[PDB]
Structure 1
């Protein structure tokens, strides 16, 4: 069974107006099989709108393309992002971790999604007791985008609620 097409798409902003369906495809085919590749254009003038999208055959190919950023396409650094499920943030809320979850539990799990810059385990302002939630800040938004599309996150035995923060 194929992964849903929405999860295989990359929206590419910041295109050179000279980028075409063919040149966008030639570039992004370096990281996987493209089932679709389109530059958005004005319906009357045919002038590029400066963005487009590519669809890979698999999610692992999307990952490969994102891991190969920055992408310079036809002389311009472009801005690839996964399809919306865009609220482009580098921080997540992690809820449901209870009182026994520590920094290393969160680091060991989340470091496989991206490079972590900050882990903040929330504690009660009055007592110092753990409140059962945390924030994790990454160096890049794609980590967050991969995280929030998963149905489940299991950390320290807890089934966690994870959402984009701020």
Structure 2
């Protein structure tokens, strides 16, 4: 069970993402994929971080938004 970010900017990265949530949510590992081969995702970043207000401070960025891209931090389900 880990968190998952949706809407990876057109230049987002992994550690940069570990640093995007690790700021208030200790990140243990994350996965970034791109290049949509089929009707599946089209660029996202998983992050199995974990902290007291983790999912909290994370919702504050429910839109993320950075390089003109409002990602969508969504943890668990």
Structure with greater proportional helix content: 1
Are positions 1:58 and 2:51 aligned together? Answer: yes
Kindly state the Cα deviation for residue 59 of structure 1 after the two structures are TM-superposed. 5.5
CA contact (8 A) 1:23 1:74 kept: no
Kindly state the Cα deviation for residue 83 of structure 1 after the two structures are TM-superposed. 2.3
Distance 2:11 2:45 in 1: 12
Matched residue pairs, number?
A: 71
Query: Considering only CA atoms, is the larger Rg found in Structure 1 or Structure 2?
Result: 1
Aligned-CA RMSD value: 2.2
* Aligned residue among 19, 24, 29 for 2:12: 19
TM-score using structure 2 length: 0.68
Relative to structure 1, is the Cα distance of residues 19 and 61 closer, same or farther in structure 2, using a 3 angstrom cutoff?
Answer: same
SS of corresponding position for 1:81: strand
SS of corresponding position for 2:23: helix
Are positions 1:72 and 2:71 aligned together? Answer: no
CA contact (8 A) 1:34 1:55 kept: yes
Distance 1:14 1:30 in 2: 19
Q: Which runs of 5+ in 1 are unaligned?
A: 1-5, 43-48, 85-166
Structure with greater proportional strand content: 1
Structure 1: 4+ residue segments shifted above 4 A = none
2:24 alignment partner in structure 1: 31
Relative to structure 1, is the Cα distance of residues 65 and 23 closer, same or farther in structure 2, using a 3 angstrom cutoff?
Answer: same
* Residues 128-162 of structure 1, C-alpha deviations (whole Å, 9 max, x = no match): xxxxxxxxxxxxxxxxxxxxxxxxxxxxxxxxxxx
